[PDB]
Design an enzyme around this catalytic site. Structure first.
Site, PDB file in Angstrom:
ATOM      1  N   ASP A 135       0.768  -1.239   0.000  1.00  0.00           N
ATOM      2  CA  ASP A 135       0.000   0.000   0.000  1.00  0.00           C
ATOM      3  C   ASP A 135       0.808   1.304   0.000  1.00  0.00           C
ATOM      4  O   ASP A 135       1.251   1.765   1.047  1.00  0.00           O
ATOM      5  CB  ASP A 135      -0.936  -0.034   1.212  1.00  0.00           C
ATOM      6  CG  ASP A 135      -1.953   1.097   1.217  1.00  0.00           C
ATOM      7  OD1 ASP A 135      -1.873   1.999   0.362  1.00  0.00           O
ATOM      8  OD2 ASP A 135      -2.836   1.071   2.090  1.00  0.00           O
ATOM      9  N   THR A 136       0.986   1.908  -1.169  1.00  0.00           N
ATOM     10  CA  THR A 136       1.735   3.165  -1.262  1.00  0.00           C
ATOM     11  C   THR A 136       1.043   4.299  -0.529  1.00  0.00           C
ATOM     12  O   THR A 136       1.665   5.317  -0.248  1.00  0.00           O
ATOM     13  CB  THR A 136       1.931   3.600  -2.734  1.00  0.00           C
ATOM     14  OG1 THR A 136       0.658   3.676  -3.395  1.00  0.00           O
ATOM     15  CG2 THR A 136       2.830   2.619  -3.453  1.00  0.00           C
ATOM     16  N   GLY A 137      -0.242   4.125  -0.234  1.00  0.00           N
ATOM     17  CA  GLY A 137      -0.993   5.158   0.460  1.00  0.00           C
ATOM     18  C   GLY A 137      -0.846   5.125   1.974  1.00  0.00           C
ATOM     19  O   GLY A 137      -1.226   6.076   2.661  1.00  0.00           O
TER      20      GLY A 137
HETATM   21  C1  LIG Z   1      -5.871  -0.941   4.353  1.00  0.00           C
HETATM   22  C2  LIG Z   1      -7.042  -0.193   3.732  1.00  0.00           C
HETATM   23  C3  LIG Z   1      -8.081  -1.250   3.329  1.00  0.00           C
HETATM   24  C4  LIG Z   1      -9.211  -1.458   4.203  1.00  0.00           C
HETATM   25  C5  LIG Z   1     -10.212  -2.419   3.871  1.00  0.00           C
HETATM   26  C6  LIG Z   1     -10.095  -3.194   2.647  1.00  0.00           C
HETATM   27  C7  LIG Z   1      -8.954  -2.998   1.745  1.00  0.00           C
HETATM   28  C8  LIG Z   1      -7.948  -2.029   2.087  1.00  0.00           C
HETATM   29  C9  LIG Z   1      -6.892   0.930   2.604  1.00  0.00           C
HETATM   30  C10 LIG Z   1      -5.846   1.977   3.037  1.00  0.00           C
HETATM   31  C11 LIG Z   1      -5.492   3.160   2.137  1.00  0.00           C
HETATM   32  O1  LIG Z   1      -4.660   2.628   1.138  1.00  0.00           O
HETATM   33  C12 LIG Z   1      -4.494   4.182   2.556  1.00  0.00           C
HETATM   34  N1  LIG Z   1      -5.144   5.254   3.358  1.00  0.00           N
HETATM   35  C13 LIG Z   1      -5.379   6.393   2.412  1.00  0.00           C
HETATM   36  C14 LIG Z   1      -6.074   7.529   3.150  1.00  0.00           C
HETATM   37  N2  LIG Z   1      -5.445   7.931   4.369  1.00  0.00           N
HETATM   38  C15 LIG Z   1      -6.231   9.006   5.001  1.00  0.00           C
HETATM   39  C16 LIG Z   1      -5.736   9.595   6.324  1.00  0.00           C
HETATM   40  C17 LIG Z   1      -6.546   9.427   7.502  1.00  0.00           C
HETATM   41  C18 LIG Z   1      -6.103   9.972   8.772  1.00  0.00           C
HETATM   42  C19 LIG Z   1      -4.847  10.670   8.819  1.00  0.00           C
HETATM   43  N3  LIG Z   1      -3.979  10.877   7.677  1.00  0.00           N
HETATM   44  C20 LIG Z   1      -4.490  10.305   6.438  1.00  0.00           C
HETATM   45  C21 LIG Z   1      -5.272   6.710   5.254  1.00  0.00           C
HETATM   46  C22 LIG Z   1      -4.426   5.568   4.696  1.00  0.00           C
HETATM   47  C23 LIG Z   1      -4.428   4.503   5.740  1.00  0.00           C
HETATM   48  O2  LIG Z   1      -5.436   3.783   5.877  1.00  0.00           O
HETATM   49  N4  LIG Z   1      -3.324   4.377   6.488  1.00  0.00           N
HETATM   50  C24 LIG Z   1      -3.000   3.449   7.573  1.00  0.00           C
HETATM   51  C25 LIG Z   1      -1.576   3.768   8.096  1.00  0.00           C
HETATM   52  C26 LIG Z   1      -3.902   3.552   8.754  1.00  0.00           C
HETATM   53  C27 LIG Z   1      -2.960   2.111   7.154  1.00  0.00           C
HETATM   54  C28 LIG Z   1      -8.308   1.565   2.380  1.00  0.00           C
HETATM   55  O3  LIG Z   1      -8.762   2.565   3.047  1.00  0.00           O
HETATM   56  N5  LIG Z   1      -8.980   0.927   1.446  1.00  0.00           N
HETATM   57  C29 LIG Z   1     -10.333   1.255   1.041  1.00  0.00           C
HETATM   58  C30 LIG Z   1     -10.567   2.490   0.160  1.00  0.00           C
HETATM   59  C31 LIG Z   1      -9.970   3.739   0.093  1.00  0.00           C
HETATM   60  C32 LIG Z   1     -10.395   4.709  -0.834  1.00  0.00           C
HETATM   61  C33 LIG Z   1     -11.481   4.439  -1.761  1.00  0.00           C
HETATM   62  C34 LIG Z   1     -12.161   3.174  -1.768  1.00  0.00           C
HETATM   63  C35 LIG Z   1     -11.753   2.204  -0.856  1.00  0.00           C
HETATM   64  C36 LIG Z   1     -12.125   0.794  -0.481  1.00  0.00           C
HETATM   65  C37 LIG Z   1     -10.956   0.149   0.212  1.00  0.00           C
HETATM   66  O4  LIG Z   1     -10.006  -0.437  -0.662  1.00  0.00           O
END
Ligand SMILES: C[C@H](c1ccccc1)[C@H](C[C@H](O)CN1CCN(Cc2cccnc2)C[C@H]1C(=O)NC(C)(C)C)C(=O)N[C@H]1c2ccccc2C[C@H]1O
Lengths: 99, 99
Positions: B25-27
């Site tokens: 996860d690059t995000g």
């Molecule tokens: C593992 C997550 C996941 C959950 C459930 C199922 C698959 C993957 C994935 C994570 C995101 O890639 C990255 N995300 C981007 C926004 N910022 C934000 C932030 C929040 C608070 C403070 N600083 C930054 C948060 C960051 C994140 O979750 N970081 C950690 C350190 C807590 C892990 C995520 O949120 N995925 C969902 C997703 C995301 C966007 C659109 C559609 C969808 C559906 C899913 O794929």
């Protein structure tokens, strides 16, 4: 271009004649942008992540320019902490992970 | 290797002698793993994702393998729906984003 990950992978996007900053996010299935106005009809949708689920508006077939490359796909708008470019658009621009 | 994004970028990792599936996860700024009983001392911490904050346990200097590539760093443990390898570890294995 080739992007290293010592810093957040942020890029400039052009959406609706508006410039914005977004994060290239491979862990996101979809693309979510902060609340903003977009033309066209939208349908209510819910997406979940770490922390839980949120309500977003779904816009279809939206033209978006990402770091110079054109894409046209689904864009979600809602109370997201940051603009994220998901896999649905990353694949459109031929994005890959390498190592 | 080169990984496409048609599907969630999942790979095998080894941590604490265990093999698990993880999302590149690059995000994610940090690495987050599903609840597990790792030995060692840890500190409490809050991390925020799409729908809020979750409480997790922070373990430092943890050895971890990602697709045969050895790395070591900080790992957060908590009720995450999926295992996530963040940038702190991706940089260690020379992972880049390319398009
Ligand atoms: C593992 C997550 C996941 C959950 C459930 C199922 C698959 C993957 C994935 C994570 C995101 O890639 C990255 N995300 C981007 C926004 N910022 C934000 C932030 C929040 C608070 C403070 N600083 C930054 C948060 C960051 C994140 O979750 N970081 C950690 C350190 C807590 C892990 C995520 O949120 N995925 C969902 C997703 C995301 C966007 C659109 C559609 C969808 C559906 C899913 O794929």
């Amino acid at each position: 271009p080739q992007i290293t990950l010592w810093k957040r992978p942020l890029v400039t996007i052009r959406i609706g004649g508006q410039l914005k900053e977004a994060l290239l996010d491979t862990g996101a299935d979809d693309t979510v942008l902060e609340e903003m106005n977009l033309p066209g009809r939208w349908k209510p949708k819910m997406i979940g992540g770490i922390g839980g689920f949120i309500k977003v508006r779904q816009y279809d077939q939206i033209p978006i320019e990402i770091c110079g490359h054109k894409a046209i796909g689904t864009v979600l708008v809602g109370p997201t902490p940051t603009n994220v470019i998901g896999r649905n658009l990353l694949t459109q621009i031929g994005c890959t992970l390498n190592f």
